[PDB]
Design a protein around this nucleic acid. Sequence first.
RNA 1: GGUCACUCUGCUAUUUAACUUUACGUUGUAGCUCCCUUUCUCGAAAGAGAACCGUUGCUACAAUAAGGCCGUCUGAAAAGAUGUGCCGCAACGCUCUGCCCCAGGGGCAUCGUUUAU
DNA 2: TAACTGGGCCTGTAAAGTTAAATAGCAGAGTGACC
DNA 3: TGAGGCCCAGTTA
Length: 858
Amino acid sequence: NPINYILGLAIGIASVGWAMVEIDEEENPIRLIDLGVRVFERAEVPKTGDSLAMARRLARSVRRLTRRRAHRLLRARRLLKREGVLQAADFDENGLIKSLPNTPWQLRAAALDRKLTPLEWSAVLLHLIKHRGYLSQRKKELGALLKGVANNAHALQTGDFRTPAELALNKFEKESGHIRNQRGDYSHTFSRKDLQAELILLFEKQKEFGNPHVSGGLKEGIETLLMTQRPALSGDAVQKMLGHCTFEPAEPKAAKNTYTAERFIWLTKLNNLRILEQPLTDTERATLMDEPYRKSKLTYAQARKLLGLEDTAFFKGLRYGKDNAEASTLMEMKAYHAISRALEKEGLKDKKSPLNLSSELQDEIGTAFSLFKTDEDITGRLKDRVQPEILEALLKHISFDKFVQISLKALRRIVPLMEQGKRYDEACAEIYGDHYTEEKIYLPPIPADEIRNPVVLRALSQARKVINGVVRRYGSPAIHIETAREVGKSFKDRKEIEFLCQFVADHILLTGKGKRRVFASNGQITNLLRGENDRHHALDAVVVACTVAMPWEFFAQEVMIRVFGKPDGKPEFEEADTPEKLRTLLAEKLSSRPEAVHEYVTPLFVSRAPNRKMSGAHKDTLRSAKRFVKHNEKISVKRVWLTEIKLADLENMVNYKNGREIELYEALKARLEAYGGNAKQAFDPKDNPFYKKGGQLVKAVRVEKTQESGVLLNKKNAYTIADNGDMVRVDVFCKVDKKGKNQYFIVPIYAWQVAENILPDIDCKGYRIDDSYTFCFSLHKYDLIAFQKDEKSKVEFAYYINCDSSNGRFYLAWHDKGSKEQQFRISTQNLVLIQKYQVNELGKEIRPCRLKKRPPVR
RNA sequence: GGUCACUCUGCUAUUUAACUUUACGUUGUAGCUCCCUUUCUCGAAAGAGAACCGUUGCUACAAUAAGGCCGUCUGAAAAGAUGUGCCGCAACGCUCUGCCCCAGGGGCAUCGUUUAU
DNA sequence: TAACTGGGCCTGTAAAGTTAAATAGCAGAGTGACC
DNA sequence: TGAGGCCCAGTTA
């Protein structure tokens, strides 16, 4: 059983194609065997184009935020009890404070004029901690957050406002009518230092007025809780994110702000610099060499005049000849200079004289400040290595933030040769021998660490899966990469239009085609050479497969008929459903020299990768569920803003459907009619506010929404429900006893149910399943199923996408049918007479599968 | 000479991954508040007046995935005090396991890795 | 009275910082394999 | 910027 393969593969943003021929003698093809194609779905979010890992990272972030705020307030209450502000009777069973006032702003303002109750004081402290304002956290033209906070800081620094509470109450409430920020506005934010000042002033004033709980421990604890945050970077956070040195793989990259690395950059600039008059000898280089070290900034014109030069010869590679950008800095020794500045103003350094330190000491402090950012870590690396006065000055002034590509060892080895005049390549060759790649029968797993794009990463991991399936089944081959213009890097550019090279190069076989048995294709040529889309990727696959002058001929007609059974002419063709109609049809229609199918027979349909993850999440909107629980009526209630409302919501208003407020409904509907449904304009704030009967503003109204199912949240504390969302899988249930026909039932399983470890027993429209119902199987996203509509039908295998919770309907699509809007089909199955499972291998191994053990959730 | 690719340095644009925070928004519960269904009470009537529920606006507090776990102590156990406390919406893979498929060989995972105190 | 069907509507957000890394382009110094 | 979730109103067996 020997064959030989030169099968080509096509890469798309969501697709991968393959088609196998066997050119035998030397670069001269034969007829085809097993054409095929697989397809997946992108590593992005369809609507927004963000990364799926991005939503996950923001979930982690907000989880940590809420947890830390809860814990902060918890410790605040503990400190309140510990310092004797409140007694154990003032705390309820949940650990919350009973009769805690809801007037913290007014109390914060009155605390400058009178004494505060222990409960008023506790409310004030916890409110200050909870809304603890914005902290600069930074190492121009400000936006809106910074604008608002800076304006408020300037406002309480001028006149009638001693604290944010006074300014807040008086100005905010009398000018706007509310104190907090509303609907994305930032104009009421205070800087955390302003609130810290409020806290110190409040403690002092309360001590004046005879507050008993002005304890030092209490003040320290409240101030700590207010000010403390975790460091953004700590420990090995920077090191874990570093790359690998080019020559020394066991050694980390050197920091850009170190004497060694900065001088390495300087030497690269100097040695590589050439003057043109219609290189630079060691004396001129050595003149310029130590000039930037204490001369502040070395521009190119200063270098020219420093070495004399002329006006007749030039230093190559510079733009803007007319604008005379000769003061563009040739070199700035920024790390050395910043260290010197720091030690000059704060510590001890004569500005005229050059600050000095063991070159290794400069390297240590540069490394410590680039790799560690908090004072604890920095001193923990600089305590025993150097002494504390300079350490304090440097900790207070210096901040370095980038790296280079060569390790400190390799640099300390290279820089000497570069000072002597040798170049980077010459020094690297003299040291490492100017030679610095195992091949395998299977391509090993892809590395993701060499490119940002998850789209490309997933596309190429699936490309590797496909080519390794080719290598497994159809022997080892001689592959012809072909990546699309859309496939490389898309979204903004892709929406406007609407790494594997090296990996394969070094990690897999080539069978002696000179140097390489590969051909990197140029699909432009593919578009030219060919002399509402189905599985159309045969094109790029074999046009990649077949080192050309670029226009050689062979014949096509067969290939079209193998790609589509209805092809080689009009598409009303029968499209052979079996392999033997394929062989017969193609053979006889091409009758002539039977170069093609007979023994190879290959029916193709795209291999669509399935999604059987169990992870997921419910919807992020919280809705009232009091009626959903207490009276089991299948509705929820949610506020809707008037600027986003429509007549459907207006008719579903809570106080309209129960006739409570009919005239309010009439006025709102009247205004929305007056603008033809333009809710953004009918109820525009500060241009067209809506006023209820009696003069009260209306900004949003509660609207009822049909709630057949959902997940209940905060069950210990409230009646809240959220839409189910993220159906992870739906399990089938087969029952015959219709007294006659045999029926199907489908029960959906969501993510919150895989989290609560519950396995439902309610068919979408049907009701409870007993031991009478017979479980058939369970399917997920993008699984293949058999499909027999009714009495008479072709079995019509197709892939499954969605299930409808209302009636158990199924969104489907077949091979080459991918566009959801264009090509999904939606079949019902209460009477479907057979619905079956299947498996599709990478290539085309469409063998049915079946399991009868109902797989539970964990 | 031309082309392509690669190593290093400088600048520009874009993208990725990780972390610390703020301000919202949503739901609930209090309080004050705009309306308003219903039911009652005083009424001979005219009319008042209470109550639950709904609900407009503002303030506060709680929750903000569903689910699970940590360190530190007073000590015998129940526990009780306490923390700049910690994972959970992604991708990838086949050492441990489960399923599915064809003594191996795979695919998919609720298995494992990035991943943790 | 129960399914089937074509249609259709609602879905969490903005801002402020510390970082590392990848691609592309331009400029500068080299190298290799090809054509 | 889109697709999943799933209801709605009319029709049908």
